[PDB]
């Protein structure tokens, strides 16, 4: 009949918590060509094999939209960005006023440009006139088209990214330290929040490839058996609705224009790398996608959508937001697309959609310092697999109308860690049994 | 203006295309005899049209970089003729000239000496109270002469026209020489000659008034 | 299967309209597209303009200010026009049937072709000489036979004196005689005058009489001269 606390150690309890992940990737060699910007310097090698433990009985509520493993990874991502920036050459002294004109071809528009100006050289006193080629999205008139600047020179500062490093995104681990652990979603039909029947721990993630990417999402997972529709709020037309496909469609996106390197030095040491003369055609970039498997995969998406809402539904094309929300940019090889997305949302014959590059950008809406992305010698190809959507709505319960857009970087993260949650374990319980101790 | 290209007889000749590309190009090429219609050897890049032989052929551009050449085998004397090519391509715009001619000549061509013939003045010239020797040189080869007029040893110089040498269907050369006199100076010397020189060789035909 | 025949005056007076027209015998007019180059002397030869099926004309910027091409519909003939003409205008005029490809080098929807036009079929060609200087009649005179070389062969000819402009057709027997025959460049002469001989090489078995007479014809002086050869 008397009862005595006893005190137990390592019980299996835990609560919601946020705490600071770290890096984890595995032991890639890259020998020739090193030094991407997500491996960075020195990233924590992953375990040989990672234990993943179901946790039998475990009924635990998600929520991927108040997840911090997201704001983390777009915090880490924005400071690795800068990171690699730093040491890079700073292209200040190229704001000179630049002399354009057209780039020869057939009479039927012209966005590249030849655009001759001076520049500093390697000594302070001598000046150098140089020419390099240029895309329209990167300048505009000063005065008039006789000569023109760098977008970017009014608003902001630009830099070059280093020639070494990549852009490619490959697979990041994200690790929780000890005294602490990683749940993931193991149900199949998962929504984005709620109780998760089926759950497993683990200490560190999946390999996530951080795919920057606008309106359709590439290279991510797909979601088992039926396609996923995920919101935060379904009601709320201001909150973005990420889709999940089952079966992926495939993009192929080519800059078909030879073009070249120009080293042209700015200064002791200081190499700004300017677009040569294009060899060869003039043909701007574009990318395909099968009539017949976007038809299908948009059909499934509507009868999946009509789940909530239930009644016509649209898709239009993007009518709001800067040049880099409303098409569907990305990176493909070095150089930054551009694609015009109307002809998939107006609702083998492969639909093409026309591709701008731009070589000057401001990723995650970045107000001050510019990148340059660095012409990439000879002709560009790529082949992805698009594994989602970033849709939106006009915001009634007549029609329903749909746009693509990418309003926050941050929904391309949560379309991976959807399935993660952090918690921090609490192994001290006291409970009572029929037990004292020496008096 | 013109561009001089030389080639041994049954000898395989290629031709410069000038002014070559910048992209994808579908040239032309062009052979020209002088004062008789052109005759286009090839269309788009490799082919030709039908009636032209298997000899003549030009360079397709599967792969950017290659140089428009027209490429004659067994090189025989009627090849010879000026070639145009005209240039169309992708960055250019619309090409109005055709290209710089390239006059191709066939050398090691066989020599033949001057068959002259020398015409004393027409009976119906002297009664229109003028007269005109008329020293007629045809089938030589190479078509380069020197024509000298003679009053019995004493040379002329003078009312002496002659037209340089023109190729003939026989692909030898023809030239004629004209010498104006009035009939009083025709019947005042005891004959007239005409001296063609072709190469060493001179080949002289004399006339005399009857 | 497609002929060609170019027709013209041959002399035009400076700062007047040059015509000249081209008769097609093989197909109709407005099935393929006609084009007119010219071969002005000690010059490469020189596109001056096309006109399309759609009679849709097209002229080289150096001379789009003084050209015009037409094409008649009734007579299988295209005509050119050139106004205020000068000594440089001077040139072997030919008309041709042209042909449009495309040569297609990306995508169709984006652009990236380009068209291209190659003259197939030719015809023979017009000479058409620009000069303030009147048009002036040949004057035949027969060259006799010498009675020439070893026997068979014996040589005779017609002499064609002082005429302009170039040129001169000549034929031996209203053309029934072809062999032996040899008519040879002109001369112009110091006076401003052309003058070219013809002659024919015959067996000396064969004179005579076999009546031998050379038939000269100068389309711009509109003279035809008959005349016969005899020792
Ligand atoms: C997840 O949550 C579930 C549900 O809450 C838990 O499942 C329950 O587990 C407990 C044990 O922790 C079970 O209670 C025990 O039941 C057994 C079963 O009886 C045996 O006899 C029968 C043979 O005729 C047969 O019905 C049984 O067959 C099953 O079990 C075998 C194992 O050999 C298995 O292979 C099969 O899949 C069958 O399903 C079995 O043979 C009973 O024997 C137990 O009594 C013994 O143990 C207790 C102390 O543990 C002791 O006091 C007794 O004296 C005796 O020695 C005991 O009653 C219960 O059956 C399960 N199901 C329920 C409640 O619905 C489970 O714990 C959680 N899983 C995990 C992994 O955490
Ligand atoms: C994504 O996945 C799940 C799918 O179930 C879903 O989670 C929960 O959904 C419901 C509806 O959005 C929320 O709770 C309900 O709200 C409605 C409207 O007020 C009520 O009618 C519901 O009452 C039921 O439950 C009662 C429980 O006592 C019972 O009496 C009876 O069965 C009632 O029918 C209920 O309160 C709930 O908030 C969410 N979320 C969570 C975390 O549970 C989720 O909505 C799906 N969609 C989205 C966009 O996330
Ligand atoms: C979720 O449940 C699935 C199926 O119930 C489990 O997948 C198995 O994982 C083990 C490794 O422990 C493999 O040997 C099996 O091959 C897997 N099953 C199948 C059907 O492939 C797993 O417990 C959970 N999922 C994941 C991704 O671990
Ligand atoms: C803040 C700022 O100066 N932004 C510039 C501006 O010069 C320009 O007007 C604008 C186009 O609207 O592009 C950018
Ligand atoms: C990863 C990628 O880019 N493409 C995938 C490929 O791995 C896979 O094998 C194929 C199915 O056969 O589907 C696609
Ligand atoms: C470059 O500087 C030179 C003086 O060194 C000047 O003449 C020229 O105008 C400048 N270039 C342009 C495009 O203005
Ligand atoms: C530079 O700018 C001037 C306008 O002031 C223009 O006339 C000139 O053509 C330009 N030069 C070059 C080489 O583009
Ligand atoms: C969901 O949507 C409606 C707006 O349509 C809003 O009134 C409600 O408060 C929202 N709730 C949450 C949790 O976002």
């Known amino acids: 009949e008397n009862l005595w606390v006893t005190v137990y150690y390592g019980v299996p309890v835990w609560k919601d918590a946020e705490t600071t992940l770290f890096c984890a990737s595995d032991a890639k060699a890259y020998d020739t060509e090193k030094r991407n910007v997500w491996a960075t310097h020195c990233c924590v090698p992953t375990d040989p094999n990672p234990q993943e433990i179901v946790l039998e009985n475990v009924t635990e509520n998600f929520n991927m939209w108040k997840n911090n493993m997201v704001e983390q990874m777009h915090t880490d991502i924005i400071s690795l960005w800068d990171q690699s920036l730093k040491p890079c050459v700073k292209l200040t002294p190229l704001c000179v006023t630049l002399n354009c004109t057209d780039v020869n071809a057939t009479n039927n528009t012209e966005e590249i440009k030849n655009c001759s100006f001076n520049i500093t050289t390697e000594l302070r006193d001598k000046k150098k006139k140089v020419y390099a080629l240029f895309y329209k999205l990167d300048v505009v008139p000063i005065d008039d088209n006789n000569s023109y600047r760098l977008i970017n020179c009014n608003t902001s500062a630009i830099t070059q990214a280093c020639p070494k490093v990549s852009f490619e995104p490959i697979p990041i681990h994200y690790c929780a330290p000890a005294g602490f652990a990683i749940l993931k979603c193991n149900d199949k039909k998962f929504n984005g929040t709620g109780p998760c029947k089926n759950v497993s721990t683990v200490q560190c993630t999946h390999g996530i490839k951080p795919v920057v990417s606008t309106q359709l999402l590439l290279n991510g997972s797909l979601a088992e058996e039926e396609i996923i529709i995920r919101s935060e709020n379904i009601t709320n037309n201001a909150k973005t609705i990420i889709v999940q496909l089952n079966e992926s469609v495939e993009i192929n996106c080519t800059r078909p224009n030879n073009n070249t390197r120009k080293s042209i030095r700015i200064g002791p040491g200081q190499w700004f790398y300017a677009t040569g003369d294009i060899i060869g055609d003039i043909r701007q970039a574009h990318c395909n996608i099968s009539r017949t498997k976007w038809n299908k995969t948009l059909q499934q998406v509507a009868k999946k959508l009509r789940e909530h809402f239930n009644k016509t539904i649209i898709f239009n094309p993007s009518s709001g937001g800067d040049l880099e929300i409303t098409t569907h940019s990305f990176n493909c090889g070095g150089e930054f697309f551009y694609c015009n997305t109307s002809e998939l949302f107006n609702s083998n014959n492969t639909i093409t959609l026309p591709c701008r590059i731009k070589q000057i950008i401001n990723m995650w809406q970045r107000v001050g310092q510019a990148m340059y992305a660095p012409p990439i010698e000879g002709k560009i190809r790529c082949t992805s697999n698009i594994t989602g959507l970033l849709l939106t709505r006009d915001g009634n319960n007549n029609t329903e109308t749909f746009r693509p857009g990418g309003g926050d970087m941050r929904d391309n993260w949560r379309s991976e860690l959807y399935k993660y949650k952090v918690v921090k374990i609490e192994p001290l319980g006291v409970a009572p049994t029929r037990c004292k101790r020496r008096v | 203006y013109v561009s001089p290209l030389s080639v041994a007889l049954g000898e395989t000749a290629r031709i410069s295309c000038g002014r070559q590309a910048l992209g994808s190009r579908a040239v032309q090429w062009y052979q020209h005899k002088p004062g008789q219609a052109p005759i286009l050897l090839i269309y788009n890049n490799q082919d030709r049209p039908s009636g032209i032989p298997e000899r003549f052929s030009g360079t397709p551009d599967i792969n950017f970089g290659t140089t428009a050449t027209l490429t004659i085998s067994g090189v025989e004397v009627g090849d010879e003729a000026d070639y145009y090519c005209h240039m169309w391509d992708s960055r250019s715009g619309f090409s109005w000239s055709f290209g710089g001619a390239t006059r191709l000549t066939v050398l090691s061509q066989p020599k033949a000496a001057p068959s002259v013939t020398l015409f004393p003045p027409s009976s119906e010239e002297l009664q229109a109270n003028k007269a005109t020797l008329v020293c007629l040189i045809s089938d030589f080869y190479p078509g380069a002469v020197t024509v000298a007029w003679k009053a019995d040893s004493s040379p002329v110089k003078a009312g002496v026209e002659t037209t340089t040498p023109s190729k003939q269907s026989n692909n030898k050369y023809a030239a004629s020489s004209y010498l104006s006199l009035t009939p009083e100076q025709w019947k005042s010397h005891k004959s007239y000659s005409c001296q063609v020189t072709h190469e060493g060789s001179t080949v002289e035909k004399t006339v005399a008034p009857t | 299967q497609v002929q060609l025949q170019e027709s013209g005056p041959g002399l035009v007076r400076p700062s007047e309209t040059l015509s000249v027209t081209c008769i097609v015998s093989?197909?109709?007019?407005?099935?393929?597209?006609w084009t007119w180059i010219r071969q002005s002397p000690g010059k490469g030869l020189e596109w001056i303009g096309y006109?399309?099926?759609?009679?849709?004309?097209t002229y080289n910027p150096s001379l789009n200010s003084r050209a015009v091409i037409s094409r008649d519909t009734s007579k299988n003939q295209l005509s050119l026009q050139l106004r205020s003409v000068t000594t440089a205008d001077t040139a072997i005029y030919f008309c041709?049937?042209?042909?449009?490809?495309?040569?297609?080098?990306?995508?169709?929807?984006?652009?990236?072709?380009?068209?291209?036009?190659?003259?197939?079929?030719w015809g023979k060609g017009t000479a058409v000489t620009v000069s303030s200087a009147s048009t002036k009649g040949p004057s035949v005179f027969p060259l006799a036979p010498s009675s020439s070389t070893s026997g068979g062969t014996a040589a005779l000819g017609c002499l064609v004196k002082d005429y302009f402009p170039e040129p001169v057709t000549v034929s031996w027997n209203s053309g029934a005689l072809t062999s032996g025959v040899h008519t040879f460049p002109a001369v112009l002469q110091s006076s401003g005058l052309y003058s070219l001989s013809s002659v024919v090489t015959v067996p000396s078995s064969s004179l005579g009489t076999q009546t031998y007479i050379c038939n000269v014809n100068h389309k711009p002086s509109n003279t035809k001269v008959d005349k016969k050869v005899e020792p």
């Open positions: 093989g197909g109709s007019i407005s099935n393929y597209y």
């Open positions: 041709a049937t042209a042909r449009r490809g495309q040569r297609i080098y990306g995508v169709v929807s984006f652009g990236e072709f380009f068209y291209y036009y190659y003259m197939d079929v």
């Open positions: 006109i399309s099926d759609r009679e849709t004309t």
